[PDB]
Design an enzyme around this catalytic site. Structure first.
Site, PDB file in Angstrom:
ATOM      1  N   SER A 181       0.848  -1.195   0.000  1.00 32.29           N
ATOM      2  CA  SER A 181       0.000   0.000   0.000  1.00 32.29           C
ATOM      3  C   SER A 181       0.882   1.243   0.000  1.00 32.29           C
ATOM      4  CB  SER A 181      -0.970  -0.128   1.175  1.00 32.29           C
ATOM      5  OG  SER A 181      -2.096   0.634   0.937  1.00 32.29           O
ATOM      6  N   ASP A 416      -8.930  -3.932  -6.908  1.00 31.39           N
ATOM      7  CA  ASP A 416      -8.502  -3.327  -5.657  1.00 31.39           C
ATOM      8  C   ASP A 416      -9.181  -1.973  -5.488  1.00 31.39           C
ATOM      9  OD1 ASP A 416      -7.056  -2.085  -3.542  1.00 31.39           O
ATOM     10  OD2 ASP A 416      -5.310  -3.332  -3.997  1.00 31.39           O
ATOM     11  N   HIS A 443      -7.627  -5.566  -1.338  1.00 33.72           N
ATOM     12  CA  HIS A 443      -6.452  -4.708  -1.278  1.00 33.72           C
ATOM     13  C   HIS A 443      -5.292  -5.503  -0.688  1.00 33.72           C
ATOM     14  CE1 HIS A 443      -3.921  -1.293  -1.144  1.00 33.72           C
ATOM     15  NE2 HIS A 443      -4.020  -1.075   0.154  1.00 33.72           N
TER      16      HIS A 443
END
Ligand SMILES: *[C@](O)(C(=O)OC)[C@H](C[C@@H]1CC=NC1=O)NC(=O)[C@H](CCCCN)NC(=O)[C@H](Cc1ccccc1)NC(=O)O
Length: 473
Positions: A181, A416, A443
């Site tokens: 991320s 995502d 995600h």
């Protein structure tokens, strides 16, 4: 306290911790232009390898503001056997995050509770002024508790320099790094500053440093609406779906369940759903809880439970999902991830200060992601927190340029919501590395139960083999 240039003093970790974990702190300068000045202490965790050690696998969960020590403890449970053999699993708390000192603090526990109790839907002139007045007071609390100097140097440009000091402190000539991320921004920032020090790098759930902030936010709003549609279509196949059996009406039914949490005659009045918790479920927490569940299909059942409760005007599950996003424990105490996320984000790029751009973004966001928009477009919208930030940005949007960088792997998930699939394709193009595609609505995926993905990154981490072009899992 650790001193600058001193080796890390490892020790068995605190309150059971598995795998003979070792804990320690590394000192880094607050301002790398003044290493004589103030010093930050970075908390590290280390899980020693069980076989022939290649080096350390340093990970970061992203956020920003998420604890890397916490993340390494979770990844240790799902770490493949061959990776656990050849690598020390190493997590670290970035500067100002979690156990690192000083840790970014702006809001007390009550400040966060008070904000979450508000519907946060009134975008009239009075509503926008109220939101921006709370924002200005939030920024003031950041300055009062942190000071401008530490806030100025908390950006990713300094985390990348800390990451190289961590690599040397761990005894590795080159860095083996897995970033999730926001950790992919740490990765690309490290790849640009220390390309000659990268042995291997996996970036799962990519952020594009060359992206325009407005269009990236609108692409994320589209990602969460696509994830909502995928969740609603799945729920529609299941008996007793609280959004009905027609996925084309799921957004309407969703709003019939969350909109009554706001007083229809006064958007500033919360009408929270009953919970065992004394807070109840506000509209803003209902939306935050929905967003949390859309990060993984493992939470889709919880979203279904939360919406079925809303049919009876109960909000226990959606409140718990919102607590999971905001990291509010069972005693009502927040970790500093929320305040750290803001402070780090506000220095990583120039903020959006144009009122017309902010208003037009809300107009398009309402059309792009109707599930998380209340009422109608008002013609006004509040500026973000970073528009009031008192220290300048330390990074500017640009295409990643690391020409001599070793081949890397970017893992991108097709649907995502948080970091859309195209963002991973764009980052892999800038890094000129390999793109590993995962088909799903979630995600991140690395080291989370998928043997196809895990065997790919295991062969890359150990042997340097990149997945072939067009690899799909
Ligand atoms: C990634 O770091 C992550 O999942 O962390 C755990 C991710 C990367 C960001 C996405 C775009 N640029 C980034 O750097 N961060 C997040 O998803 C954060 C943190 C989650 C909370 C965990 N305690 N949150 C958001 O990005 C947020 C999502 C959202 C959309 C719509 C309504 C409410 C929230 N969006 C945002 O800040 O704009």
């Amino acid at each position: 306290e650790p001193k600058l240039g001193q080796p890390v003093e490892w020790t068995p970790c605190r309150s059971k911790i598995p795998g003979g974990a070792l804990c320690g702190k590394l000192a880094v300068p607050v301002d790398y232009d003044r290493p004589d000045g103030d010093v930050a202490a970075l908390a590290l965790i280390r899980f020693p390898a069980t076989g022939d050690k290649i080096g350390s696998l340093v990970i970061n969960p992203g956020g920003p503001g998420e604890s890397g020590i916490e993340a390494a403890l979770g990844v240790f449970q799902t770490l493949p056997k061959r990776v656990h053999e050849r690598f020390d699993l190493v997590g670290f708390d970035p500067r100002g995050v979690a156990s690192s000192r000083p840790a970014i603090w702006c809001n007390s526990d009550a400040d966060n509770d008070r904000l979450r109790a508000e519907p946060q839907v009134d975008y009239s002139r009075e509503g926008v002024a109220h939101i921006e007045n709370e924002t200005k007071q939030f920024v003031g609390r950041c300055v009062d508790k942190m000071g401008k100097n530490f806030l100025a140097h908390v950006g990713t440009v300094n985390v990348a320099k800390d990451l190289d000091a961590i690599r040397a402190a761990l005894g590795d000539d080159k860095l083996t790094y897995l970033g999730y991320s926001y950790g992919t921004r740490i990765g690309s920032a490290y790849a640009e500053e220390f390309p000659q020090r990268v042995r291997a790098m996996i970036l799962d759930g990519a952020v594009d440093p060359n992206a325009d902030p407005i269009e990236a936010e609108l692409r994320q709003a589209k990602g969460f609406q696509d994830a909502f549609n995928n969740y609603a279509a799945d729920c529609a196949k299941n008996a007793g779906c609280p959004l009905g059996a027609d996925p084309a009406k799921a957004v309407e039914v969703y709003h019939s369940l969350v909109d009554p949490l706001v007083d229809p005659d006064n958007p500033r009045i919360s009408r929270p759903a009953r919970t065992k918790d004394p807070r109840g479920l506000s509209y803003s927490d209902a939306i935050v809880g929905t967003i949390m569940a859309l990060y993984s299909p493992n939470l889709w059942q919880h979203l279904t439970d939360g919406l079925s409760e809303l049919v009876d005007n109960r909000g226990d599950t959606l409140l718990a999902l919102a607590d999971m996003y905001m990291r509010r424990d069972s005693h009502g105490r927040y970790n500093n991830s929320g305040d750290a996320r803001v402070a780090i984000n506000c220095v990583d790029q120039p903020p959006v200060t144009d009122r017309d751009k902010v208003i037009d973004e809300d107009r398009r966001a309402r059309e792009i992601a109707p599930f998380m928009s209340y009422g109608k477009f008002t013609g006004d919208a509040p500026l973000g927190t970073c528009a009031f930030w008192p220290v300048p940005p330390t990074s500017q949007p640009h295409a990643v340029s690391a020409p001599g960088l070793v081949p890397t792997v970017v893992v991108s998930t097709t649907h995502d919501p948080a970091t859309p699939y195209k963002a991973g394709v764009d980052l892999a193009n800038q890094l000129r590395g390999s793109l590993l595609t995962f088909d799903g609505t979630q995600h991140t995926v690395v080291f989370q139960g998928d043997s196809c993905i895990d065997e790919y990154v295991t062969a890359y981490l150990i042997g340097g083999t990149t997945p072939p072009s067009g690899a799909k899992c």
